[PDB]
């Protein structure tokens, strides 16, 4: 009804926050949330930081593939 | 800036869309005289529209990438208003209804004929009983503790 | 013959729903109460078996229909006095669209008021109504002004007579029972003076004010209607022939009035309609034609016909008694008499809807294409679905007011004793069309899709010319001036002759060709006619008794099923062959419908340039698109939509929105239709379980809804969202293009 | 009327009143404060 | 043939066998009730499965009950 009348601006748009938030833990920068993963300086990031991460971290920030695509209301 | 939002006094997008609504409220108003009634609504719409965007950029709100408002309902005491105390007033109501239809459900339960008391509603009744639903939360509190909330 | 006060006029009935009937009368144990309360309010058969108490409950209801109907009347007669841009419209006919409705602003729904023309803002109607004004001669809203208080007088007469000819003066059933009388006075007085008074009604307003308006008048200087009648120098510098008086008309000498009563035929090429001279004389004659039938049937002065007598006289070797014993049974039964009128009055109302497009009868209607396609799909869906409830109807009659032993008829006995050659003779034709109708689409389809166009059904490779209908065009084309000598041209520009009538850049009417696909249109709706006709008609004839259940005649007329028993006997009913065809009736006329729009937009309707070009609006493609199955669903409903889903931001956003709110609306219904009761009745009980348990579970308990009102829901959703769907498509459609 | 007034308490008559009554208090309310997006008291 | 089945809650109203529409249904004396009265069910390879008899029972949760079985020409109502 909101498109109908022709203010777009009237619209009900919700953020994804939860899902956002647990994309961040994974290592996406999208957001700026910086927990877990997604930050340089946590016990999360510097247990595998020489094991699978830098790998990982490359293929979830790159927004070619399908891995983790961004979300919205 | 939550999700990587943008306030939106600060968003370009937010401007141009506002622009682009004036712009084509403002062609319309070519096609009349400016003493005639359509010119005035024409007018009235434009400032309404002025109004509603001014207001949009006062109260805080944030815009994504094509300048339309978004949302935080995470509980975040800066967007309290979007949806915290909507939703409280909101449920006060609604219990307010639901605890006066309760309370008139049992005041009739004991006559002869409770049926018939629900297609024709007895008015002085639910009168004197729509009063009492204004401090539903305290009574129905109460009757919770006296255990008398849950059927036997 | 009346009662005086038969009934008192007392609030007390008001107080005790149900009154009508003594199982309703109890109290709401259930909520099913309530649902019966609704579904038997106007079964006055039910409420009581004495027939003058059903006669005088009838007379009263009609005219509370007659209120309704004059409130409309005015409430259209002043919304275009007060919010309509009519005044304007008149001086610019064709740059300037109807509108009579305006909106508040709200909630930004004044986004409806676009503009349309006149330095006016609101929405463009389609009804007609400016045309029908025009060609009555008004010209100022002061007019409109007084007609709408003069219905509104009129909606509280017939309010008034509708309390008094019930509460203080009923007729007796000997009154009812009248059926000569009522036929002499409904074909002199009402249809005979009626059209008498509506034919000097043209003759001394249409007429004058229509010229001048012709003439290039400007609206606000043309003199009034009275003074033409004041002044009959005015007239006669219009007509001479006014000047020699009613003389001519008493000495026989009528050729002296051809100058306002013509036969020219054909269409006024400055506002695209039919003459008006054409229109007074058809009416002239018209009146003289039902005032000489109105004194055929005998009364009071021994002079007339018996319609008994007559009945009584037409047997044969094939029929044995005849029409004998048929005049009691539509003297004595409500449902008969409505059954046939229903099935007359649906048949009528099409064939106007198929006459009101080729002979435009009003001014400037041919160039409006919306106002001409809305007329053509409302009348069309009216008259099928009067056509449906005749046969409901029929049934209803067949299963209460059938009684051999005191009502015998034997045309009606005949035909009750062979109806399975009837049944299986129906059947057999319907599988033949069915076969060698949509099949040829099919075929069609598979060889386009194989890459063999030149193995189609089709102008080009294989022909199937409707050689009939070309015969009928060709003769109708060459009448005047052979078999019509007194005809100037033809009746119809669509027969064939080969004129054009362009109004204000527009093409208003012109011959229509026919080819392959209008012979394969044609032959689906033959189908489709013979499908809705087996299944309305099997409902009627197996409505007492069959093989299955031999007595069906005691279950009713109303009824689910007999039970699983004889591998299951659910819909045997006659409501149920109602139910199954108003889905055939539906599909029929949307199959029809389409049709219309198609033809029109690529064969007629367009635009004319000054050398003399015509540009159709969809560039002709209906000859070589419309034989296969996928042309319609791309060159149709695909192109066609794409105004309709457009239309969000603009003022035609209404119809946007309401295409998607009929598409709810029609796929709501699937889920009553699907679905059946024992699911729902199970699941309400563990919904009752929590509201027992917080102690507001309510004293009338809930039930599901029966097997029959499950049905009426879901056809009634069914019929509602695709009729709105198809509304708002058409409307979108036509008012952008 | 006892029985005039009886008519007036039947369930029909009853929500319509009480529906029309509350649709003009809604439309009074979103005229006078209009496009209303959050709470900012 | 369906199967009809009696059980000792019956109350002798005699409404299930006067709703029958082929004759499968009698009543016999017992003890046991106040009408002093059973139906009986003799007749079953003329049943068509209706179910009429049990529409017609007063009983809380029918005293006769159709088990539909094995179909035959008479059990579906064929006059071919
Ligand atoms: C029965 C047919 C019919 C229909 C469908 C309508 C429909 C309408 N009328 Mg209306 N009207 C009718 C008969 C009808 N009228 C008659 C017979 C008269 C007296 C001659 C009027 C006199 C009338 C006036 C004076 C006005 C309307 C208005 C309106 C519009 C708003 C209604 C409203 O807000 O009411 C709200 C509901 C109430 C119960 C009040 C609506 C489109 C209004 C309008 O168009 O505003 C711009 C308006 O001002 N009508
Ligand atoms: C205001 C005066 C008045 C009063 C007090 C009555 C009182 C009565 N009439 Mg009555 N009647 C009146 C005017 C009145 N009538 C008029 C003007 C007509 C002509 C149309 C009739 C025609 C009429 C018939 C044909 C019958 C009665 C009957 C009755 C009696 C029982 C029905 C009843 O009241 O149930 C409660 C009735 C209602 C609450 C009325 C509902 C009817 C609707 C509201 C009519 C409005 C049409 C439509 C719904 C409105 C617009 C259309 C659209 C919105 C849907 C009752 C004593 C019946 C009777 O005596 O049988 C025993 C009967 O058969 N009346
Ligand atoms: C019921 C319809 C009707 C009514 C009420 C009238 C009424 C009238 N006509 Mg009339 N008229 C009618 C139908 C009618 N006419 C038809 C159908 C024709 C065509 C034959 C005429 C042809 C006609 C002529 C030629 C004249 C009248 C005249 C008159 C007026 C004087 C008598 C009178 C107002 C006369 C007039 O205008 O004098 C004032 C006059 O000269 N009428
Ligand atoms: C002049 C026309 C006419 C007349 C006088 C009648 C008269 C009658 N018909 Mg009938 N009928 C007609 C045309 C007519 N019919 C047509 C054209 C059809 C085919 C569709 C039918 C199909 C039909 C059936 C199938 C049945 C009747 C029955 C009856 C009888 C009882 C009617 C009743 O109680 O209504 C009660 C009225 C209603 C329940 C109102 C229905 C409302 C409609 C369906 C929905 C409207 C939607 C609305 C816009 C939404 C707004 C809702 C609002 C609350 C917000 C009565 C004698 C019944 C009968 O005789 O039973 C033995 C019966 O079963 N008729
Ligand atoms: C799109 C779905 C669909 C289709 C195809 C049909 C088709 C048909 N319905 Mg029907 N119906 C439908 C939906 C449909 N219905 C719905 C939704 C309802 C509402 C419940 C009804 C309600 C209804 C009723 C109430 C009745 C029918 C009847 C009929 C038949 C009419 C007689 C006939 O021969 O027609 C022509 C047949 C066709 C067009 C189907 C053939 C399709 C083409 C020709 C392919 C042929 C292939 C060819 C044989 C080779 C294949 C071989 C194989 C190895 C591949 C026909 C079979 C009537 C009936 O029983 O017959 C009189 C009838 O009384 N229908
Ligand atoms: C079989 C089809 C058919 C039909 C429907 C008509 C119909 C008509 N003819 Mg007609 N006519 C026909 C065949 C037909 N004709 C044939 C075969 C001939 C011989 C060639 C004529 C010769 C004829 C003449 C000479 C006249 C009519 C006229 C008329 C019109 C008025 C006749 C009347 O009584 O009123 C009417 C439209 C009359 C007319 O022109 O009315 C305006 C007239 O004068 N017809
Ligand atoms: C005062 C009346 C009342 C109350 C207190 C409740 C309370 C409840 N209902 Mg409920 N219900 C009601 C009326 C009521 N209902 C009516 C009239 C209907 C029919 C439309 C339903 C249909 C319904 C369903 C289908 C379900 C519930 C469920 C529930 C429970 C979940 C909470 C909830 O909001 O569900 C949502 C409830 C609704 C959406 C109901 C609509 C609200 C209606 C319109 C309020 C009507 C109030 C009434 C007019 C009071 C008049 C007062 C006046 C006389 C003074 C809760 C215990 C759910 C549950 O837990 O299952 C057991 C569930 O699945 N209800
Ligand atoms: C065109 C003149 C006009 C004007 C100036 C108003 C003005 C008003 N109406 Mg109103 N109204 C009008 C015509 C008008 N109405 C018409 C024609 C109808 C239909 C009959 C209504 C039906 C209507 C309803 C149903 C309600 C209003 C209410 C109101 C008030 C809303 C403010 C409020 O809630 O604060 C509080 C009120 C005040 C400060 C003063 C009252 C406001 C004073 C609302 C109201 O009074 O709220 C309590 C309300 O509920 N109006
Ligand atoms: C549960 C669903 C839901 C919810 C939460 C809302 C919530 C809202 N709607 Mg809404 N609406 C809904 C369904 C819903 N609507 C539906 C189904 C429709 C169609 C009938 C509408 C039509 C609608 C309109 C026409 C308007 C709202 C408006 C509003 C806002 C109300 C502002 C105020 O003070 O009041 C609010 C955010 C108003 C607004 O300005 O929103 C910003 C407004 O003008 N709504
Ligand atoms: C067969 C030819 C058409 C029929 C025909 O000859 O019509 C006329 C024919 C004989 O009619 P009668 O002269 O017997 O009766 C005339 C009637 O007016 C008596 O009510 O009708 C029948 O025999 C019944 C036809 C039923 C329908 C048959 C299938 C079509």
């Known amino acids: 009804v909101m498109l109908a009348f022709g203010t777009p601006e009237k619209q009900i748009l919700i953020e994804p926050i939860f899902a956002q938030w647990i994309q961040s833990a994974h290592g996406k920068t999208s957001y700026g949330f910086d927990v877990l993963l997604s930050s340089t300086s946590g016990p999360a990031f510097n247990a595998g930081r020489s094991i699978w991460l830098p790998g990982w971290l490359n293929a979830i920030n790159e927004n070619s593939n399908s891995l983790f695509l961004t979300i919205g209301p | ?152 | 013959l009346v009662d005086r006060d038969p009934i008192k006029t007392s609030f007390e009935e008001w107080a005790k729903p149900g009154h009508f009937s003594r199982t309703i009368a109890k109290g709401p144990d259930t909520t099913t109460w309530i649902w019966n309360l609704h579904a038997d309010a106007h079964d006055f058969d039910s409420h009581t078996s004495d027939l003058e108490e059903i006669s005088r409950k009838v007379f009263s209801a009609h005219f509370g229909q007659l209120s309704i109907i004059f409130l409309w009347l005015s409430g259209m007669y002043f919304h275009g006095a007060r919010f309509s841009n009519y005044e304007a419209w008149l001086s610019d006919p064709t740059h300037i669209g109807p509108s009579a409705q305006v909106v508040w602003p709200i909630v930004g729904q004044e986004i409806l008021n676009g503009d349309v023309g006149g330095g006016f803002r609101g929405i463009q109607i389609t009804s007609g109504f400016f045309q029908i004004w025009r060609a009555s001669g008004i010209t100022s809203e002061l007019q409109l002004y007084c007609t709408a208080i003069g219905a509104l007088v009129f909606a509280a007469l017939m309010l008034f007579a509708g309390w008094f000819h019930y509460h203080k003066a009923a007729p007796k059933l000997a009154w009812f029972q009248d059926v000569e009388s009522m036929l002499n006075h409904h074909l002199a007085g009402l249809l005979g003076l009626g059209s008498l008074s509506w034919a000097g009604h043209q003759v001394h307003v249409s007429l004058p004010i229509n010229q001048f308006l012709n003439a290039g008048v400007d609206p606000k200087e043309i003199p009034l209607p009275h003074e033409f009648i004041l002044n009959r120098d005015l007239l006669a510098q219009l007509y001479p022939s006014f000047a020699e008086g009613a003389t001519p008309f008493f000495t026989l000498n009528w050729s002296k009035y051809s100058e306002f009563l013509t036969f020219r035929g054909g269409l006024d090429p400055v506002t695209g309609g039919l003459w008006l001279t054409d229109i007074a004389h058809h009416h002239l004659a018209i009146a003289i034609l039902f005032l000489i039938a109105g004194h055929m049937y005998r009364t009071n002065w021994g002079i007339g016909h018996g319609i008994k007598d007559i009945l009584e006289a037409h047997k044969g070797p094939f029929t044995g008694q005849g029409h004998k014993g048929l005049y009691e049974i539509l003297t004595t039964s409500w449902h008969a008499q409505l059954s046939l009128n229903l099935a007359m009055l649906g048949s009528l109302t099409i064939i106007v809807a198929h006459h009101m497009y080729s002979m435009p009868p009003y001014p400037y209607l041919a160039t409006d294409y919306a106002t001409q396609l809305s007329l053509f799909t409302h009348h069309m869906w009216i008259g099928g679905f009067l056509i449906v409830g005749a046969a409901a109807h029929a049934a209803i009659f067949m299963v209460r007011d059938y009684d051999p032993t005191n009502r015998y008829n034997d045309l009606l006995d005949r035909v009750l004793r062979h109806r399975d050659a009837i049944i299986s003779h129906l059947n057999w034709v319907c599988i033949f069309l069915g076969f060698h109708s949509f099949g040829l689409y099919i075929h069609n389809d598979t060889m386009s899709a194989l890459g063999r166009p030149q193995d189609m059904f089709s102008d080009t490779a294989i022909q199937l010319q409707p050689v009939f209908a070309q015969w009928i065009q060709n003769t109708h084309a060459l009448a005047p001036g052979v078999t019509a000598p007194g005809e100037t041209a033809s009746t119809s520009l669509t027969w064939g002759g080969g004129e054009l009538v362009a109004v204000g850049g527009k093409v208003a009417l012109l011959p229509i060709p026919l080819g392959t696909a209008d012979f394969l249109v044609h032959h689906i709706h033959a189908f489709t006619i013979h499908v809705t006709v087996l299944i309305l008609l099997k409902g009627v004839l197996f409505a007492r008794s069959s093989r299955l259940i031999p007595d069906k005649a005691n279950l009713g007329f109303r009824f689910p099923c007999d039970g699983p028993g004889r591998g299951g006997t659910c819909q045997v009913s006659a409501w149920d062959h109602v139910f199954l065809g108003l889905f055939w009736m539906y599909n029929a006329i949307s199959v029809v419908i389409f049709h219309f729009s198609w033809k029109m937009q690529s064969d007629v309707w367009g635009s004319i340039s000054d050398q003399g070009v015509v540009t159709h609006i969809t560039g002709g493609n209906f000859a070589q698109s419309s034989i296969t199955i996928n042309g319609w669903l791309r060159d149709f409903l695909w192109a066609q939509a794409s105004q309709v889903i457009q239309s969000y931001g603009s003022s035609l956003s209404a119809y946007g929105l309401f295409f998607l709110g009929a598409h709810f609306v029609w796929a709501f219904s699937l889920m009553f239709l699907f679905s059946g009761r024992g699911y729902w009745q199970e699941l309400i009980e563990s919904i009752v379980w929590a509201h027992n348990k917080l102690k507001v579970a309510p004293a009338t308990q809930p039930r599901a809804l029966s097997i029959i009102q499950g049905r009426a829901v879901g056809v009634t959703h069914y019929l509602l969202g695709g009729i709105a769907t198809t509304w708002a498509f058409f409307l979108a459609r036509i008012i952008a293009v | 009327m006892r029985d005039l007034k009886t008519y007036l308490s039947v369930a029909p008559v009853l929500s319509t009143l009480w529906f029309g009554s509350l649709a003009g208090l809604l439309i009074e309310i979103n005229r006078l404060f209009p496009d209303a997006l959050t709470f900012p008291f | 043939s369906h199967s009809v089945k009696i059980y000792d809650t019956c109350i002798g109203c005699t409404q299930c066998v006067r709703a029958c529409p082929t004759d499968v249904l009698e009543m016999i004396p017992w003890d046991g009730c106040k009408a002093k009265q059973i139906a009986s069910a003799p007749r079953t390879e003329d049943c068509v499965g209706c179910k009429r008899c049990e529409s017609a029972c007063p009983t809380d949760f029918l005293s006769v009950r159709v088990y539909l079985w094995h179909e035959t020409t008479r059990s579906m109502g064929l006059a071919y």
């Open chain 2, 1 to 152: 800036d939550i999700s990587g939002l943008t306030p939106c006094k600060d968003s370009k997008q937010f401007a141009k869309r506002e622009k682009q609504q004036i712009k084509k409220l403002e062609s319309s108003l070519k096609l009349y005289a400016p003493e005639s009634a359509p010119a005035l609504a024409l007018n009235a719409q434009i400032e309404k529209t002025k109004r509603r965007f001014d207001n949009y950029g006062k109260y805080g709100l944030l815009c994504g990438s094509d300048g339309l408002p978004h949302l935080i309902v995470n509980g975040d005491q800066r967007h309290w208003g979007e949806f915290i105390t909507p939703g409280i007033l909101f449920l006060y109501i609604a219990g307010w209804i639901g605890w006066v239809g309760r309370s008139y459900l049992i005041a009739i339960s004991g006559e002869k004929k409770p049926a018939m008391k629900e297609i024709i509603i007895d008015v002085p009744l639910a009168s004197r009983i729509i009063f009492r639903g204004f401090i539903w939360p305290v009574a129905a509190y109460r009757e919770f503790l006296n255990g008398d909330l849950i059927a036997k």
